[PDB]
Amino acid sequence: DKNELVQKAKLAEQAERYDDMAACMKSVTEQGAELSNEERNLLSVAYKNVVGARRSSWRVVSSIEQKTEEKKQQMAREYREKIETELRDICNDVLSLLEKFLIPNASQAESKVFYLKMKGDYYRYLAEVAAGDDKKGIVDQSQQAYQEAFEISKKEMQPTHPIRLGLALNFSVFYYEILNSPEKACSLAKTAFDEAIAELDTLSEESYKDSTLIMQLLRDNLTLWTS
Amino acid sequence: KNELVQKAKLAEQAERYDDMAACMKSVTEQGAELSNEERNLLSVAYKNVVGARRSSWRVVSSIEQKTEGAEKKQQMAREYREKIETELRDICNDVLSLLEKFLIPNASQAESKVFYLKMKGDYYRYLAEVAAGDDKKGIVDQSQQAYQEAFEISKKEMQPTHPIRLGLALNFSVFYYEILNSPEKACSLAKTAFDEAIAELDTLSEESYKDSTLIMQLLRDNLTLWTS
Amino acid sequence: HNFVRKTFFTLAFCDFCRKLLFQGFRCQTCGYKFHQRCSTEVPLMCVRDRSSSAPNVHDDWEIPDGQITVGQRIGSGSFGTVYKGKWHGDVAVKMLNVTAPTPQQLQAFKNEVGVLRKTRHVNILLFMGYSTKPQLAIVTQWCEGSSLYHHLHIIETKFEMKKLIDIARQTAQGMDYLHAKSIIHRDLKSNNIFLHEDLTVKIGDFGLATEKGSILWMAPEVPYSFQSDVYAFGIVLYELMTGQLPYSPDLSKVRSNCPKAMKRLMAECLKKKRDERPLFPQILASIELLARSLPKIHRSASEPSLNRAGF
Ligand SMILES: O=C(c1c(F)ccc(NS(=O)(=O)N2CC[C@H](F)C2)c1F)c1c[nH]c2ncc(-c3cnc(C4CC4)nc3)cc12
Numbered sequence: 001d002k003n004e005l006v007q008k009a010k011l012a013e014q015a016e017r018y019d020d021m022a023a024c025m026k027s028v029t030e031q032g033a034e035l036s037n038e039e040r041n042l043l044s045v046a047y048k049n050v051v052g053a054r055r056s057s058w059r060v061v062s063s064i065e066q067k068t069e070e071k072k073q074q075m076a077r078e079y080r081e082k083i084e085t086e087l088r089d090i091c092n093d094v095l096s097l098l099e100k101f102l103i104p105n106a107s108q109a110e111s112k113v114f115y116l117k118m119k120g121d122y123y124r125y126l127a128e129v130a131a132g133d134d135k136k137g138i139v140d141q142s143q144q145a146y147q148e149a150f151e152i153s154k155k156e157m158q159p160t161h162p163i164r165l166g167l168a169l170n171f172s173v174f175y176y177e178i179l180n181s182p183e184k185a186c187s188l189a190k191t192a193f194d195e196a197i198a199e200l201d202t203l204s205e206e207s208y209k210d211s212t213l214i215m216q217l218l219r220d221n222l223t224l225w226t227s
Numbered sequence: 228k229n230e231l232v233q234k235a236k237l238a239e240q241a242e243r244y245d246d247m248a249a250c251m252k253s254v255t256e257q258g259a260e261l262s263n264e265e266r267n268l269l270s271v272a273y274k275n276v277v278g279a280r281r282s283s284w285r286v287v288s289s290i291e292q293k294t295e296g297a298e299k300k301q302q303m304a305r306e307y308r309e310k311i312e313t314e315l316r317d318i319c320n321d322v323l324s325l326l327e328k329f330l331i332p333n334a335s336q337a338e339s340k341v342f343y344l345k346m347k348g349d350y351y352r353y354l355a356e357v358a359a360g361d362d363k364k365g366i367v368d369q370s371q372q373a374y375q376e377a378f379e380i381s382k383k384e385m386q387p388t389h390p391i392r393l394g395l396a397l398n399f400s401v402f403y404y405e406i407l408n409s410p411e412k413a414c415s416l417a418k419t420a421f422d423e424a425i426a427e428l429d430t431l432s433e434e435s436y437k438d439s440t441l442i443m444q445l446l447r448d449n450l451t452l453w454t455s
Numbered sequence: 456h457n458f459v460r461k462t463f464f465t466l467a468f469c470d471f472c473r474k475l476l477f478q479g480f481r482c483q484t485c486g487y488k489f490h491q492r493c494s495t496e497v498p499l500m501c502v503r504d505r506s507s508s509a510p511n512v513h514d515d516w517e518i519p520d521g522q523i524t525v526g527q528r529i530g531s532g533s534f535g536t537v538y539k540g541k542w543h544g545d546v547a548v549k550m551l552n553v554t555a556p557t558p559q560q561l562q563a564f565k566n567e568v569g570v571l572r573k574t575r576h577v578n579i580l581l582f583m584g585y586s587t588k589p590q591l592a593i594v595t596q597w598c599e600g601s602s603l604y605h606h607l608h609i610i611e612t613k614f615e616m617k618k619l620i621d622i623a624r625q626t627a628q629g630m631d632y633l634h635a636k637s638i639i640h641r642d643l644k645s646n647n648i649f650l651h652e653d654l655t656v657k658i659g660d661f662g663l664a665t666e667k668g669s670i671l672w673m674a675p676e677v678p679y680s681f682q683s684d685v686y687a688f689g690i691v692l693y694e695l696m697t698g699q700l701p702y703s704p705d706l707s708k709v710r711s712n713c714p715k716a717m718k719r720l721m722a723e724c725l726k727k728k729r730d731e732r733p734l735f736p737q738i739l740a741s742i743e744l745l746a747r748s749l750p751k752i753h754r755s756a757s758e759p760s761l762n763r764a765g766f
Binding site: 442 | 475
Binding site: 173176177213 | 460
């Protein structure tokens with residue numbers, strides 16, 4: 001039952017083993033009912049750490065090959081592909097889960113932004129790995145999802161909201177890092193920081209220390225981008 | 228085969244230890260004696276695969292024994308712990324069968340034998356934390372035979388400051404304090420190894436100064452803790 | 456701060472008490488670490504104990520007079536002068552002032568030679584011999600690349616961030632050995648650091664232990680202790696990361712691409728009190744953590760997870 005699987009997933013939150021955490025929440029979602037916000041983060045963090053391990057691993061094996069350039073590198077090449085072929089499966093299972101079960105039954109403001117932003121991220125993570133033609137197809141999709149969430153959010157969410165700023169932070173990073181449009185990314189973040197701080201008191205005790213963290217994330221990105 | 232050795236070296240940097248161990252095991256299965264570089268890979272590979280489970284078990288077991296009375300919850304945590312333990316056991320058994328089938332039978336020099344035997348004495352101390360009942364005593368006895376055997380060869384063939392010997396005193400002394408609950412018998416073994424390396428300190432070498440001085444800090448830390 | 460559960464392989468040392476750490480928390484913003492025991496007393500101005508086990512592992516010296524060719528005076532100070540020369544190849548000579556020492560001074564020199572012939576760490580300047588007949592001198596290896604002070608101020612601009620950190624890594628990896636031999640290097644400074652070939656660092660000026668313009672590198676308490684050497688290493692970090700000279704130093708001057716893990720490392724070493732400072736076994740450990748995280752967490756900041764720990 002759903003209530004049981006939530007506990008069986010928070011047992012892998014503590015004591016890690018996130019591959020088990022994914023299995024519990026994945027089955028929870030397939031029931032078709034809308035997830036509670038607390039139950040929504042568990043599916044977010046369950047996959048945030050499964051991919052985050054291969055993302056970090058892929059980068060290191062990438063820097064090694066760029067530095068060796070050679071039978072050593074001929075083998076180090078096939079090992080980088082091994083990590084890539086895993087990132088593909090992890091991303092596909094989230095997207096199919098988002099497309100087939102979560103998004104269709106969202107039926108609420110905050111939920112719609114959450115799932116589309118998430119759909120945006122897991123397409124971006126494929127861009128960092130895919131080749132030219134596949135990158136373009138993937139790059140466009142990450143933008144439609146990002147843009148679609150970018151539309152609903154600005155219409156309905158408060159001036160300050162962790163999901164609101166979190167989409168601006170991730171959308172700008174998509175421009176700066178994937179589309180190589182530093183000024184296109186700079187303006188997006190700059191306004192988000194300005195709008196949020198202009199009305200900072202709209203936050204409240206339950207989330208102000210959560211949203212304020214993202215504001216430091218936005219400001220630091222601009223400082224690095226201005227240099 | 229060097230391909231396996233570099234594959235493991237690749238795996239360590241990527242931080243994929245479950246795949247690193249699967250390579251070093253395939254090296255050890257070939258019947259050749261490991262060099263002191265390949266040998267030190269097999270130690271790092273399996274002590275990280277096990278170290279994950281030991282960490283999972285030490286937190287689940289503390290979630291249990293808390294929130295007394297909630298039977299349905301405490302039934303869920305209890306059944307989860309014993310799933311970790313079986314996975315943890317399968318690792319230690321694989322290590323132990325690997326030592327006793329290929330490595331220990333063909334360890335020629337004293338250095339190797341004091342090394343492989345300490346491993347054998349370590350992986351039984353891991354099972355002694357998981358097992359219960361008569362099996363705990365059946366395991367704890369088996370640990371002492373390996374720790375004792377290595378200690379005799381160490382006292383005779385290796386210098387006081389050699390990190391292998393200076394670490395056998397650390398792991399063996401703990402086995403007396405935690406598994407056997409004998410503080411005095413642990414302190415005596417700890418103090419003895421500690422001073423013998425201090426007296427002959429200048430034998431320290433460029434290739435071992437950092438490794439040896441770390442263990443002497445760990446050895447001193449336990450002493451103060453136990454005497455605290 | 457926002458923390459998370461973390462289990463550490465390789466090595467780590469809790470930033471509060473600095474004992475070996477295997478299973479604890481850490482802060483995602485700055486990478487701070489700590490045990491659960493000391494979590495209740497971790498600072499918040501963000502700017503049943505158990506036992507630990509074994510962790511993972513990875514007369515003929517004298518030179519007769521006239522054999523050594525003497526070149527041009529490169530520099531002088533303290534109680535001697537430096538010259539380039541040739542003796543079985545390129546060499547360097549520290550010409551001490553005294554030519555006719557008293558037996559007590561000579562015996563002091565004899566003991567120093569007894570010590571200096573034992574130290575053979577890669578990141579210290581190789582010892583090649585001594586001479587008493589013409590004058591008190593010590594013969595070392597000659598490093599073509601001038602002192603690190605010369606590579607920041609005269610010829611400069613040739614240091615990437617990765618190479619910039621690696622120099623402070625070998626500086627500590629060489630001063631850890633000088634503490635594992637119980638020698639306090641009193642006068643560490645960027646002019647006492649040399650670069651031989653393909654940038655292999657070498658430390659000097661630690662000799663003359665028996666006998667034993669520098670204002671910038673002198674510690675505030677300088678007066679001598681292991682803690683005093685840590686501050687001197689802290690000042691060397693400031694010159695590297697900032698690319699300038701000191702003058703507290705302004706940490707804000709650092710480059711943009713240097714991560715905050717190095718920002719916090721430098722801040723500790725410059726701590727006013729001796730006690731709060733770390734020691735080189737740990738400094739050498741964090742800097743190798745800070746070095747493993749360059750090819751891994753180079754990025755433009757993404758979105759972090761909400762706080763998943765409370766204390
Ligand atoms: O200065 C010394 C030196 C020495 F010769 C003898 C003794 C000591 N000190 S010691 O006795 O403590 N010492 C500790 C370890 C050693 F075993 C003994 C010295 F510090 C050098 C040794 N080799 C060098 N190569 C190059 C330069 C150099 C380069 N560029 C410049 C720029 C101005 C242009 N100036 C100078 C300097 C030295």
